[PDB]
Amino acid sequence: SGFRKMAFPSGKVEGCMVQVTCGTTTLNGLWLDDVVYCPRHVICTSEDMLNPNYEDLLIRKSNHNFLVQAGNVQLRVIGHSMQNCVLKLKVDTANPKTPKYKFVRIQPGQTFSVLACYNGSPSGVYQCAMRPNFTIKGSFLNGSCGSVGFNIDYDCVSFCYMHHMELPTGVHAGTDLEGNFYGPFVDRQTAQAAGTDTTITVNVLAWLYAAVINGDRWFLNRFTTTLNDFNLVAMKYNYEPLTQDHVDILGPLSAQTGIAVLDMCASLKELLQNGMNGRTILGSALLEDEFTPFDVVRQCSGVT
Amino acid sequence: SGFRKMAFPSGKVEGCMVQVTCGTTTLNGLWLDDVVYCPRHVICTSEDMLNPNYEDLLIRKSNHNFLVQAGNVQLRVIGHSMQNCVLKLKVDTANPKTPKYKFVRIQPGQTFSVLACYNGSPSGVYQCAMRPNFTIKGSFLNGSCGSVGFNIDYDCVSFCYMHHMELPTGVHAGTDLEGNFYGPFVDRQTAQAAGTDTTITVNVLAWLYAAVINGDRWFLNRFTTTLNDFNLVAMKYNYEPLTQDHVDILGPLSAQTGIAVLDMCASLKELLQNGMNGRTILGSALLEDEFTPFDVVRQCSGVT
Numbered sequence: 101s102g103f104r105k106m107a108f109p110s111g112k113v114e115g116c117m118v119q120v121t122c123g124t125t126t127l128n129g130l131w132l133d134d135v136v137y138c139p140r141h142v143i144c145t146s147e148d149m150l151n152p153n154y155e156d157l158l159i160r161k162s163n164h165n166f167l168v169q170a171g172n173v174q175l176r177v178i179g180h181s182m183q184n185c186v187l188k189l190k191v192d193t194a195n196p197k198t199p200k201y202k203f204v205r206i207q208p209g210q211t212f213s214v215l216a217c218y219n220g221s222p223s224g225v226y227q228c229a230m231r232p233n234f235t236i237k238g239s240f241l242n243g244s245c246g247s248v249g250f251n252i253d254y255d256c257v258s259f260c261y262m263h264h265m266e267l268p269t270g271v272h273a274g275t276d277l278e279g280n281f282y283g284p285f286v287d288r289q290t291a292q293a294a295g296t297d298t299t300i301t302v303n304v305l306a307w308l309y310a311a312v313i314n315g316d317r318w319f320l321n322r323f324t325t326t327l328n329d330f331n332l333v334a335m336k337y338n339y340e341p342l343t344q345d346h347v348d349i350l351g352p353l354s355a356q357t358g359i360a361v362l363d364m365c366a367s368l369k370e371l372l373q374n375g376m377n378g379r380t381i382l383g384s385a386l387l388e389d390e391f392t393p394f395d396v397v398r399q400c401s402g403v404t
Numbered sequence: 405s406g407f408r409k410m411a412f413p414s415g416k417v418e419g420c421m422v423q424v425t426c427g428t429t430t431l432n433g434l435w436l437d438d439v440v441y442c443p444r445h446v447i448c449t450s451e452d453m454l455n456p457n458y459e460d461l462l463i464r465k466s467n468h469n470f471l472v473q474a475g476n477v478q479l480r481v482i483g484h485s486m487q488n489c490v491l492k493l494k495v496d497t498a499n500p501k502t503p504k505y506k507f508v509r510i511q512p513g514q515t516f517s518v519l520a521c522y523n524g525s526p527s528g529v530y531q532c533a534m535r536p537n538f539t540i541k542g543s544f545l546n547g548s549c550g551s552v553g554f555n556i557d558y559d560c561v562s563f564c565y566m567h568h569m570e571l572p573t574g575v576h577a578g579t580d581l582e583g584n585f586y587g588p589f590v591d592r593q594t595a596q597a598a599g600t601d602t603t604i605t606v607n608v609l610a611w612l613y614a615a616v617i618n619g620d621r622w623f624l625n626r627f628t629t630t631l632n633d634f635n636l637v638a639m640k641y642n643y644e645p646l647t648q649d650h651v652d653i654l655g656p657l658s659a660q661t662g663i664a665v666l667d668m669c670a671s672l673k674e675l676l677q678n679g680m681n682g683r684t685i686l687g688s689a690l691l692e693d694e695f696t697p698f699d700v701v702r703q704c705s706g707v708t
């Protein structure tokens with residue numbers, strides 16, 4: 101029992117972190133096989149960042165200008181190329197610590213672990229959700245660019261995020277490992293609108309199931325609702341509309357606890373309309389949305 | 405910017421996890437040098453757990469009865485001994501992945517990362533505090549015993565906790581790496597009183613400083629207080645009394661933000677007396693106490 105905001109074990113990812121320097125800028129790279137992946141803004145100087153012409157900036161760079169250091173050993177760069185907003189530095193040595201891996205583009209509302217790094221060295225690991233508006237509320241300081249997000253299924257690391265930018269609002273934006281930004285963001289030091297965010301409804305319901313499994317039951321009520329009635333409340337409270345696909349994914353949790361998904365929706369409706377009344381659920385005084393139904397099942401069963 | 409409940413990178417600890425089996429019980433062990441450390445209750449059966457006679461139970465065991473498996477390779481046990489509530493299984497091979505390490509006994513209120521494991525395999529990592537009452541509010545299921553807590557200072561892992569038990573209340577109890585329980589707990593399946601817990605005041609103040617650094621400032625007020633006046637409020641709200649030693653440890657944060665520690669205490673006093681009024685601080689709707697002043701400084705400066 102107990103339910104925590106658990107991140108994946110970061111070991112397999114730690115072994116891939118490297119430091120990439122170009123000119124006076126240093127950030128993190130991800131060394132997988134004989135390729136080092138990093139944010140392309142490593143080639144920029146302060147004057148460039150307001151509106152960089154990345155193609156022109158990269159043309160002034162040669163393989164020997166990219167300084168790639170793994171721990172304390174230097175990697176020899178034998179190729180460079182830009183793919184969207186990432187640079188791929190081909191190196192003469194395959195990373196001996198390359199785990200089984202995939203590059204995946206996650207959907208908004210999905211969760212992942214971030215291994216925050218500075219100068220190619222890991223500082224910490226935390227779990228977060230990709231917001232419905234494609235931002236992440238992380239913990240990143242200057243130098244953390246190139247830190248990655250990932251999920252792990254037994255021995256396979258699915259890399260889903262690479263950190264690129266902090267918006268003027270203090271929220272974070274980044275790309276998949278092919279360098280495609282999540283959301284409308286561009287890698288420029290310009291004010292950029294992040295869409296209206298919403299609370300991830302299926303995740304809040306999943307976390308309410310986790311709460312019941314672990315003993316926090318005070319919010320269970322004698323009511324039920326419908327998808328239509330619930331979505332009218334979700335609309336008012338800026339929650340994502342619940343679909344049958346979300347109900348279907350909550351199936352295992354509904355089966356385990358014996359609480360029908362629409363009955364849990366009626367508990368969520370009452371909590372939205374009345375608040376917590378100074379009470380807590382799983383040590384939180386708000387409705388938590390950073391646990392997917394898969395996360396809840398995994399944590400509640402002890403999947404390794 | 406941004407502030408997250410960050411755990412240490414778990415890589416160095418993942419390389420030490422092993423599976424220990426004795427009879428029909430399997431749990432986790434920590435392999436450091438040529439020694440495997442694990443909870444002594446691995447030698448118990450269901451009939452024993454109400455009041456085990458560990459000395460007698462261990463006498464019936466020989467080196468060949470302890471099955472130690474690292475990933476998929478079997479370790480040869482050449483010695484066994486019980487030290488307090490841990491067993492130390494001497495093996496014929498030193499762990500090639502043994503990091504630089506220390507065994508430390510942490511103080512209540514201090515924080516650490518837990519690498520939850522099952523069958524010697526890591527499932528996740530989370531950060532937590534040792535409660536003032538010496539329990540931890542973790543996430544542990546049957547099979548997680550032997551999972552460890554730790555801190556990391558550059559290349560040195562300080563192991564501070566080994567998981568042993570879940571109290572009937574769903575809170576967790578364990579030992580230091582010499583097998584001494586934190587708190588009054590005994591390794592028996594018996595109802596055991598955990599002391600009255602309190603909120604870690606110095607940590608809440610540290611987190612309020614983290615909030616100001618990251619932009620959440622709505623709780624700053626035009627008031628000040630004294631240690632005596634603040635401790636009268638701390639008493640009423642079951643907060644640990646603040647001492648000058650706590651004020652001294654908050655020094656770096658008071659220096660950085662320019663907010664005198666007693667002025668931050670007056671903000672905390674107002675929050676305790678009036679609540680959040682439906683507002684949040686660093687994404688939390690309650691006063692967070694799982695960040696020490698050292699954790700805040702580290703996260704806010706990007707220490708690796």
Ligand SMILES: Cc1ccncc1NC(=O)[C@H](C)CC1CC1
Pocket residue numbers: 141149240241242243244245264265266267286287288289405
């Ligand atoms: C400063 C910082 C703190 C946290 N995370 C990231 C950063 N870096 C940036 O946002 C730079 C300006 C991105 C570049 C325009 C492409």
Ligand SMILES: Cc1ccncc1NC(=O)[C@H](C)CC1CC1
Pocket residue numbers: 101445453544545546547548549568569570571590591592593
């Ligand atoms: C079941 C479980 C779930 C989470 N964490 C730990 C456990 N195990 C125990 O509490 C056993 C009974 C301890 C033994 C008496 C010494």
